[PDB]
Design a protein around this ligand. Structure first.
Ligand code: HEM
Length: 388
């Protein structure tokens, strides 16, 4: 694995969190770039990133976990089958049915917020995805705090005393959930575990172990990323364009468009890796089998060939939803509708309750950021809210 910081070599976390000047420089001066220190080819332009992510015949997701559940690191023809197995639990019917459940959870969390000082990461951005996933999975509401404790340890964290805590949590999680999975095979309900147990593609079906382990992968894909989107949205409403909050407060139908502009502009720096599978000179440079390619979706999202005035936050830009933050092609995020729905529901609920927010002047961004797979992520974000 190549960390972003090995390529950017930025001095501060802040420059990764707000990397606009670097993206511009790469897009304009070196859009298909060889980085000798990591032996990577780096792709920045929108059209090139989109093509690389479509062209699984030349750019593989297999680098260098039971196989049936390894969806991200697989290529066609197995990838399609493995994705379809999981997709049975994320149908549009299910997503529509989830909306009132997610609403109720967001209402409970916002319910507990008071003109007092709120840590939006601790009070909303972290817990909402976790509590939602517990509910959607079919974990009994009585065990929510216990489940959340394991998820916090495993997926927001954060010592080779840490390794030990995670080993213990993973075992506790597995021995909690496995008997639930067993019970649900015999008595299905309307929940993710039950839908996974019934899923069948070309005669392939999940074992109970595979169901449990798929739930752990779902958490690993969805918790920290969704929390990053929620926290960054509030960051942007506090520090990027202060008028946007008022616009959304007076017109809640703008919230989905605002979420797409946060995915475009405030999800930094997200990249994906591929490995060349078939020799090719289609990016205009010849790459041979085994070469490493890094596609920078954060930069593609700032490409003026696709997005007008790309270094400005603009929720009215007509084509923000063409961003590449969820990928493109065969591996495009299976969670994207859920992620979009959680963010719309959370923001809307907060906007209903609070007329104004304001930044806390003592907050230092550099001291409240940590690494993640999808870019620098906020460990807290304080704000003052006016119930007004
Ligand atoms: C803002 C939130 C999210 C972001 C930005 C995000 C981003 C991504 C990206 C970029 C990929 C493509 C990886 C690749 O091509 O190598 C991906 C794949 C995936 N995402 Fe997400 N994701 C998010 C939330 C979620 C959630 C909530 C779930 C599940 C509940 C989830 C499940 C998946 C799965 C299963 C894949 C693999 C799909 C495949 O390989 O066919 N994601 N996501």
């Amino acid at each position: 694995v190549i960390a972003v910081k090995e390529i950017t070599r930025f001095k501060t976390r802040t420059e990764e969190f707000s990397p606009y000047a670097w993206c511009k420089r790469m897009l304009e001066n070196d859009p298909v770039s060889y980085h000798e220190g990591t032996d990577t080819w780096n792709v920045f332009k929108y059209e090139d990133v989109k093509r690389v992510l479509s062209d699984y015949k030349h750019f593989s997701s297999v680098r260098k976990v039971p196989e049936k559940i390894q969806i991200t690191e697989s290529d066609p023809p197995d990838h399609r089958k493995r994705r379809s197995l999981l997709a049975a639990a994320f149908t549009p019917r299910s997503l529509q049915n989830w909306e009132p459940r997610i609403q109720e959870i967001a209402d409970e969390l916002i319910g507990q917020m008071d003109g007092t000082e709120i840590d939006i990461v601790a009070s909303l951005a972290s817990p909402l995805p976790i509590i939602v996933m517990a509910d959607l999975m079919g974990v009994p509401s009585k065990d929510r705090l216990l489940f959340k404790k394991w998820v916090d340890t495993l997926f927001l964290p954060f010592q080779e005393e840490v390794d030990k805590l995670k080993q213990v949590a993973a075992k506790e999680y597995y021995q909690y959930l496995y008997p639930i999975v067993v019970q649900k095979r015999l008595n299905p309900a309307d929940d993710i575990i039950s839908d996974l147990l019934k899923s069948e593609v070309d005669g392939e079906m999940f074992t109970d172990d595979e169901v449990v382990r798929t739930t752990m992968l779902i958490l690993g894909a969805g918790v920290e990323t969704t929390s990053h989107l929620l926290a960054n949205s509030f960051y942007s409403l506090l520090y990027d364009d202060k008028e946007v909050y008022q616009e959304l407060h007076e017109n809640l139908d703008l919230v989905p468009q605002a979420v797409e502009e946060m995915l475009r502009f405030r999800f930094n720096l997200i990249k994906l890796d591929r490995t060349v599978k078939e020799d090719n000179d289609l990016l205009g440079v010849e790459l041979k089998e085994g070469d490493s390619v890094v596609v920078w979706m954060s930069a593609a999202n700032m490409d003026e060939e696709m997005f007008e005035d790309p270094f400005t936050l603009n929720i009215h830009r007509p084509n923000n939803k063409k961003h590449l933050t969820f990928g493109n092609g065969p591996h495009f995020c299976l969670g994207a509708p859920l992620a979009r729905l959680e963010a719309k529901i959370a923001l809307t609920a907060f906007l209903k309750k609070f007329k104004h927010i304001e930044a806390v002047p003592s907050f230092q961004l550099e001291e409240n950021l940590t690494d993640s797979a999808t870019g620098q992520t906020l460990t807290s974000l304080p704000l003052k809210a006016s119930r007004m």
